[PDB]
Design a protein around this ligand. Structure first.
Ligand SMILES: [Cu+]
Length: 99
C-alpha cells in the first residue's frame, strides 16, 4: 500500500491516514509534498510486545527529497498509531490496523 507524505495540494497529511492491512504487506511511505517528513510509530500506541524501532524512523531521521520512501511491513495484529514528527501538531498523523 502506498501512502503519500503530504497531499497533492500541499496539506501536511498522510494519504491515506487510516487504513488496514494484512500481516507482511508492504507499506511504502513516499515523500510527496511539504517534505522533509518522517514516519514514527508511537511506542505507546502499537500492539503489545512490538518493537517500535523495527518499524519506525527515529524522530531525528528525515526523508529529505521528493519520492524518497520508507518501507515497512507489520506483522503483529492490532492498531498502530503513527505520526510525522515535525508535523505532528499540524495534524500529520495516522493509524494502521493490521488484521
Ligand atoms: Cu511531515
Amino acid at each position: 500500500i502506498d501512502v503519500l507524505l503530504g497531499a497533492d495540494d500541499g496539506s501536511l497529511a498522510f494519504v491515506p491516514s487510516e487504513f488496514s492491512i494484512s500481516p507482511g504487506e508492504k507499506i511504502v511511505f513516499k515523500n510527496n509534498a511539504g517534505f522533509p517528513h518522517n514516519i514514527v510509530f508511537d511506542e505507546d500506541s502499537i500492539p503489545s510486545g512490538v518493537d517500535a524501532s523495527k518499524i519506525s524512523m527515529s524522530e531525528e531521521d528525515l526523508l529529505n527529497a521528493k519520492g524518497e520512501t520508507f518501507e515497512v511491513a507489520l506483522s503483529n495484529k492490532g492498531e498502530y498509531s503513527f505520526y510525522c514528527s515535525p508535523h505532528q501538531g499540524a495534524g500529520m498523523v495516522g493509524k494502521v490496523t493490521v488484521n
